[PDB]
Scaffold this active site. Structure first.
Site, PDB file in Angstrom:
ATOM      1  N   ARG A 400       0.668  -1.332   0.108  1.00  0.00           N
ATOM      2  CA  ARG A 400      -0.486   0.390   0.603  1.00  0.00           C
ATOM      3  C   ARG A 400       0.724   1.038  -0.201  1.00  0.00           C
ATOM      4  O   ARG A 400       1.918   1.400   0.279  1.00  0.00           O
ATOM      5  CB  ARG A 400      -1.101  -0.241   1.347  1.00  0.00           C
ATOM      6  CG  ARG A 400      -2.583  -1.044   1.356  1.00  0.00           C
ATOM      7  CD  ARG A 400      -2.766  -0.051  -0.106  1.00  0.00           C
ATOM      8  NE  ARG A 400      -4.429  -1.234  -0.285  1.00  0.00           N
ATOM      9  CZ  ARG A 400      -5.588  -0.870  -0.945  1.00  0.00           C
ATOM     10  NH1 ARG A 400      -5.589   0.168  -1.176  1.00  0.00           N
ATOM     11  NH2 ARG A 400      -5.372  -1.905  -0.742  1.00  0.00           N
ATOM     12  N   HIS A 472      -6.270  -4.891   1.577  1.00  0.00           N
ATOM     13  CA  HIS A 472      -4.896  -5.799   1.140  1.00  0.00           C
ATOM     14  C   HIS A 472      -4.732  -4.794   0.445  1.00  0.00           C
ATOM     15  O   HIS A 472      -4.705  -3.649   0.369  1.00  0.00           O
ATOM     16  CB  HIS A 472      -7.088  -6.012   0.073  1.00  0.00           C
ATOM     17  CG  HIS A 472      -8.078  -4.919  -0.269  1.00  0.00           C
ATOM     18  ND1 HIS A 472      -8.266  -4.117  -1.487  1.00  0.00           N
ATOM     19  CD2 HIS A 472      -9.106  -4.463   0.393  1.00  0.00           C
ATOM     20  CE1 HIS A 472      -9.354  -2.887  -1.077  1.00  0.00           C
ATOM     21  NE2 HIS A 472      -9.760  -3.440  -0.249  1.00  0.00           N
ATOM     22  N   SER A 477      -7.010  -1.528  -7.626  1.00  0.00           N
ATOM     23  CA  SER A 477      -8.330  -0.278  -6.725  1.00  0.00           C
ATOM     24  C   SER A 477      -9.283  -0.997  -6.567  1.00  0.00           C
ATOM     25  O   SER A 477      -9.864  -1.557  -8.029  1.00  0.00           O
ATOM     26  CB  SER A 477      -8.182   1.116  -7.023  1.00  0.00           C
ATOM     27  OG  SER A 477      -9.376   1.836  -6.112  1.00  0.00           O
ATOM     28  N   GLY A 478     -10.220  -1.393  -5.278  1.00  0.00           N
ATOM     29  CA  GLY A 478     -11.584  -1.845  -6.116  1.00  0.00           C
ATOM     30  C   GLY A 478     -12.779  -0.668  -6.649  1.00  0.00           C
ATOM     31  O   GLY A 478     -13.282  -0.465  -6.771  1.00  0.00           O
ATOM     32  N   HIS A 479     -11.768   0.095  -5.827  1.00  0.00           N
ATOM     33  CA  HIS A 479     -13.428   1.625  -6.137  1.00  0.00           C
ATOM     34  C   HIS A 479     -12.645   2.363  -7.504  1.00  0.00           C
ATOM     35  O   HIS A 479     -13.706   2.122  -8.196  1.00  0.00           O
ATOM     36  CB  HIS A 479     -13.119   2.662  -5.411  1.00  0.00           C
ATOM     37  CG  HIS A 479     -13.076   2.910  -3.760  1.00  0.00           C
ATOM     38  ND1 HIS A 479     -12.862   1.235  -2.496  1.00  0.00           N
ATOM     39  CD2 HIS A 479     -14.090   3.575  -3.203  1.00  0.00           C
ATOM     40  CE1 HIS A 479     -13.320   1.353  -1.645  1.00  0.00           C
ATOM     41  NE2 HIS A 479     -14.560   2.759  -1.661  1.00  0.00           N
ATOM     42  N   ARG A 539      -9.139   8.317  -3.874  1.00  0.00           N
ATOM     43  CA  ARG A 539      -8.110   7.208  -3.098  1.00  0.00           C
ATOM     44  C   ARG A 539      -6.618   7.556  -2.915  1.00  0.00           C
ATOM     45  O   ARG A 539      -6.662   7.348  -2.037  1.00  0.00           O
ATOM     46  CB  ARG A 539      -8.607   5.541  -4.002  1.00  0.00           C
ATOM     47  CG  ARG A 539     -10.110   5.243  -4.358  1.00  0.00           C
ATOM     48  CD  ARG A 539     -10.988   4.552  -2.619  1.00  0.00           C
ATOM     49  NE  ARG A 539      -9.971   3.659  -2.109  1.00  0.00           N
ATOM     50  CZ  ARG A 539     -10.660   3.349  -0.699  1.00  0.00           C
ATOM     51  NH1 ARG A 539     -11.208   4.679   0.042  1.00  0.00           N
ATOM     52  NH2 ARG A 539     -10.115   2.262  -0.014  1.00  0.00           N
ATOM     53  N   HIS A 545      -4.354   4.634  -2.302  1.00  0.00           N
ATOM     54  CA  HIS A 545      -3.838   4.141  -3.665  1.00  0.00           C
ATOM     55  C   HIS A 545      -3.182   4.980  -4.688  1.00  0.00           C
ATOM     56  O   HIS A 545      -2.979   5.829  -4.300  1.00  0.00           O
ATOM     57  CB  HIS A 545      -5.452   3.896  -4.564  1.00  0.00           C
ATOM     58  CG  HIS A 545      -5.755   2.233  -4.109  1.00  0.00           C
ATOM     59  ND1 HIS A 545      -5.714   1.478  -4.235  1.00  0.00           N
ATOM     60  CD2 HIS A 545      -7.038   2.418  -3.527  1.00  0.00           C
ATOM     61  CE1 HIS A 545      -6.592   0.340  -3.799  1.00  0.00           C
ATOM     62  NE2 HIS A 545      -7.205   0.735  -3.406  1.00  0.00           N
TER      63      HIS A 545
HETATM   64  O1  VO4 Z   1      -8.605  -1.055  -3.764  1.00  0.00           O
HETATM   65  V1  VO4 Z   1      -9.199   0.194  -2.858  1.00  0.00           V
HETATM   66  O2  VO4 Z   1      -8.465   0.053  -2.048  1.00  0.00           O
HETATM   67  O3  VO4 Z   1      -9.569   1.605  -4.088  1.00  0.00           O
HETATM   68  O4  VO4 Z   1     -10.732   0.649  -3.644  1.00  0.00           O
HETATM   69  O1  LIG Z   2     -11.128  -1.239   0.435  1.00  0.00           O
HETATM   70  O2  LIG Z   2     -11.764   0.269   0.169  1.00  0.00           O
HETATM   71  O1  LIG Z   3     -12.850  -3.603   0.672  1.00  0.00           O
HETATM   72  O2  LIG Z   3     -12.888  -2.837   0.055  1.00  0.00           O
END
Ligand code: VO4
Ligand SMILES: [O-][O-]
Ligand SMILES: [O-][O-]
Ligand code: VO4
Ligand SMILES: [O-][O-]
Ligand SMILES: [O-][O-]
Ligand SMILES: [Ca+2]
Ligand SMILES: [Ca+2]
Lengths: 590, 590
Positions: A400, A472, A477-479, A539, A545
């Site tokens: 991160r 994670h 990025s999940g977002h 983010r 991120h």
């Molecule tokens: O993978 V993240 O922490 O944007 O959303």
């Molecule tokens: O992960 O938000």
């Molecule tokens: O994990 O969001």
């Protein structure tokens, strides 16, 4: 043939389409095993560039046991609940209270428990619709020694130092000193000032930003994200309210029509307020090495952030970070969809039954209508999330930006105490000298506010979130993957070329929307791309991120959405396609 | 096997699971071809009990040409865009202006154009996930001559006459006259006072409401929708706001924590207000026969409703009707999910990784977490909508309650003018004399307010909506099917047995939430069932759906959700199941 057999054949055909798209192999950058333990007699990997959060860390930000990360990777790849539970999460635990011993007095006084990895094996989850989580690949993440990582970390540190600076005053003289500082240092990095060379990876060429200006500072590279105000209309402006419809030749005005310009979305018969919870300005997190290491050891600091009473439209960088802190998965893009539906933004004209009912005699709710797009923009999010979870956990495991700031801070502190550690961030430390000095000043201020009268000189990336990043890896990025997927769904479903006549900025003084000085034209596609920009970069401005994570996972989300769209197109017997402007500027028909 | 092959195998396995559930055959009630043209030499079906909206109608509410409805059904079954467009939608059109000639001066002065059927062939759309739209059947709708239809239309007439009466004051003396009247008429109907006889269809027995009291008046039969306040907590109350989390041993309180009790859902970092737009109290629609016939002839009256400024928590029946008028597909249940997530309502304990992270080392966001449930509750809605569109258009084509009221009104008016028409609603006319006379008084008042100084006596069902019903058959209900599906998703995903300690009612005098007098216990399952009840019976309060439409669509949606859950369970390698309490009292493990 049989309807049930036809449904089975349609589903099998969609699965066949997903299978025939092939698997793009996912390559890591090789950082996991390339960086080694500095101990001369220890040849084990240091895993410093790997996402090692939660595993016990030594005093310098690296993990004590590289085997602890190896078991974590094995549990990622297996998915077994017992193997995940058998992983060592957090530091050593007190035998009496059962609670882990935290390095920081804050986490020990809170009696903080460990927080667990968020779906470390969601990448192994199969997908009934769209591409499999492991069928698509993001490119290798930038390496720590790369100029790209240095540029991303500079961007992150500048966002952290510029969190209280309002988007509407990016070019204002009041912020001119911090804006020109950020522009000068970003343009002082060879990632920004020097273009990509021939033979560089195509994704490296694609995600490389040119000269940083005030007009593109902290902005994305999606088409329409750099054009107009910083914040998307759909993230601040409301929508046509209930009662403002046209009935034949009579145009009734909603009694609450001003709520559109007060940032209230017509959420059915109730309202979504665009106003974000006001996080405490100037309060950053993990600016102290002990708290940072506790967070790296999974100290659950969720909810530890303090907030100002009330809510305001996103004005500061910290406001965007707060917005992306808690956003309900697809909430930005569900809200954009609600605005487009309320504003009567036409769907894609190539969708069927979009003509006036005088011609087609068919309104659209379930298919090619409001319900279709509302369900699509929300179902795409979990699929993109599974793909990005695969990318995060099984492929890249990129540390991160808080961890990168930890490596940079410990590397910069090492000569002061006579040591020399983390040479992989030496280029980042050298090229970010001025940014690191102002980060040290801000961290000293925060740690004095934290409770340390004479805090150690800290160069940690200031975190908008008390827990810092979600638990994670950062890449992707999940977002931003949900941003890419949902914005792709909205651009395909709506007439994304439709121009937005009214462009609004958040007022530079009051908590209200004003007509933006932007004299150009803003399209629906451009503003959806700007909204995906806003969430992904927000983010970044939280510190959780890097930029490349955002752009590549936005592309991954666009791929997820395209796969889902092609698969659901097999379910409709109507002659239609989605006109879909991709992030690369091309249009695909679905 | 390969990951791509494993994904294909999982998707094809979900397809085989959907196929192996079989096709429950869909039976109509035979009303389509049983009622014939009363004209002696004309033997064609009258199609009066059939959804004939849009097709041109004579002065009495029946269609001029049965061939028009036959072509409408053919276009439904084929789904062809050309055949849908070739359908005659609306009345005869002016050769000069191109606009249809409306019977009412209201629709002619508005220059109203026709509105099309909303997804007349969405039931032919295949579903990549969950049951096929045509694999599941809802029972035949009650016939016009059935006592069930009389009870349904009495309930609807009673709701229309009580739209300005607040839910917190059902047992209040000032509304005691209207509530006792409604109770006495409903309990005077053999559907309510007489129980189901042996040999009756099991669905009729299951959906038959017994003795109507003040505590169950206008309520559903789902478990938990009859105990406690009328409105579900999730439809009125807010949720834990940002900043009210627990950080170890320290319990931080949100500065905006009062927003939970103000009806403000923490929607990520922004808020959803539970306050519904106030529709004009006492303003009903289609009360005049000419406007009603224009609406039957596809007069686009959408948006013609008027509203007071601001928004308030649902108090009156008209407020619930307004809420369900515009709700964005899954909005009630997405809001309920957001409340349960912000409140920290635990997920189903049989979901994996729900223990503390000290034990499982795993947070849940993408799978078995907030994102998973949000995506599931939003994606079940469109599949349930496809199933209900099949039920509406291809199977049942049941006339809307506004059309039932039209037949009833014309049948009541016929003896006054010396004629006799629609003997199939003779039982409804006879058994609803008092309700019909109060409806006549209210309709005369509304039509005087409409603009007619001496309007003809009208027994039309007063409509909360200017267009009245959406342009599809009433049976089943899209809102009720989405409610059943989404509430099933929420009850499976969340620990639905969790009891809600705080139960709130909307205040009797102020637009705020007070502690409800309910001394019993309310569970998450019960409150979600009450929310589905609220949405479906709010559709009834609009007058756009009958009760049986609602209950059978809720069952159909529950089936859709269960099928989707079974098919998605194949995609997870985790050892888990959803504990899912059904609407029949049983629990299925998924
Ligand atoms: O993978 V993240 O922490 O944007 O959303
Ligand atoms: O992960 O938000
Ligand atoms: O994990 O969001
Ligand atoms: O089918 V209805 O949603 O008009 O609920
Ligand atoms: O239609 O809804
Ligand atoms: O609404 O349909
Ligand atoms: Ca149309
Ligand atoms: Ca857990």
């Amino acid at each position: 043939q049989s309807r049930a057999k036809a449904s089975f054949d349609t589903r099998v055909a969609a699965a066949e389409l997903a299978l025939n798209r092939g698997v793009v192999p996912s390559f890591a950058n090789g950082e996991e095993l390339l960086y080694r333990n500095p101990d001369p007699d220890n040849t084990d990997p240091s895993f410093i560039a790997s996402f090692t959060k939660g595993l016990p860390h030594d005093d310098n930000g690296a993990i004590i046991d590289p085997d602890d990360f190896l078991a974590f990777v094995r549990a990622i790849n297996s998915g077994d609940e017992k193997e995940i539970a058998d992983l060592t999460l957090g530091p050593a635990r007190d035998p009496e209270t059962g609670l882990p011993i935290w390095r920081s007095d804050l986490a020990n006084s809170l009696e903080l428990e460990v927080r667990g990895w968020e779906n470390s094996s969601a990448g192994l989850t199969f997908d009934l619709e769209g591409p499999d989580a492991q069928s698509i690949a993001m490119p290798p993440a930038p390496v720590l020694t790369s100029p790209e990582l240095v540029a991303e970390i500079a961007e992150l540190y500048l966002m952290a130092l510029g969190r209280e600076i309002e988007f509407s005053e990016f070019d204002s003289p009041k912020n001119a000193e911090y804006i020109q500082f950020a522009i000068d240092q970003l343009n002082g990095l060879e990632w920004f000032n020097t273009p990509a060379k021939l033979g560089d990876p195509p994704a490296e060429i694609r995600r490389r930003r040119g000269e940083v200006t005030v007009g593109n500072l902290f902005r994305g590279i999606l088409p329409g994200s750099e054009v107009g105000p910083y914040l998307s209309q759909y993230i601040i402006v409301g929508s046509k309210q209930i009662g403002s419809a046209t009935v034949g030749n009579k145009t009734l005005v909603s009694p609450n029509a001003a709520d559109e310009f007060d940032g209230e979305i017509a959420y059915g018969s109730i309202t979504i307020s665009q106003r974000v919870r006001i996080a405490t300005p100037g309060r950053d997190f993990m600016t102290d090495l002990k708290v940072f290491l506790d967070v790296q050891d999974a100290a659950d600091f969720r909810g530890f952030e303090s907030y100002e009473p009330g809510a305001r439209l996103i004005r500061t960088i910290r406001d965007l970070a707060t917005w992306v802190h808690f956003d309900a998965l697809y909430e930005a893009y569900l809200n954009a969809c609600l605005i487009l539906l309320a504003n009567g933004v036409p769907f894609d004209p190539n969708l069927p039954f979009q003509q006036e009912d005088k011609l087609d005699n068919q309104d659209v709710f379930v298919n090619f209508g409001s319900a279709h797009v509302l369900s699509l923009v929300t179902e795409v999010a979990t699929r993109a999330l599974k793909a990005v979870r695969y990318q995060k956990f099984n492929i890249h495991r990129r540390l991160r930006p808080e961890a990168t700031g930890g490596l940079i801070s410990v590397n910069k502190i090492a000569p002061q105490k006579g040591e020399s550690i983390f040479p992989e961030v030496d280029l980042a430390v050298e090229e970010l000298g001025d940014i690191l000095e102002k980060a040290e000043i801000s961290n000293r201020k925060q740690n004095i506010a934290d409770g340390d009268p004479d805090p150690d000189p800290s160069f940690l990336l200031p975190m908008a979130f008390a827990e810092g990043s979600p638990f994670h890896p950062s890449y992707g990025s999940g977002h931003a993957v949900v941003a890419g997927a949902c914005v792709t769904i909205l651009k395909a479903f709506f007439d994304s070329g439709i121009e937005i006549d009214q462009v609004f900025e958040v007022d530079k003084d009051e908590d209200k929307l004003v007509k933006s000085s932007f004299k150009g034209t803003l399209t629906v596609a451009g503003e959806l791309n700007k909204l995906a920009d806003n969430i992904a970069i927000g983010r970044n401005m939280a510190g959780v991120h890097y930029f490349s994570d955002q752009f590549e996972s936005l592309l991954l989300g666009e791929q997820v959405a395209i796969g889902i769209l092609e698969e659901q197109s097999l379910t409709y017997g109507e002659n239609f396609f989605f006109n879909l402007p991709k992030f690369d500027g091309t249009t695909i028909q679905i």
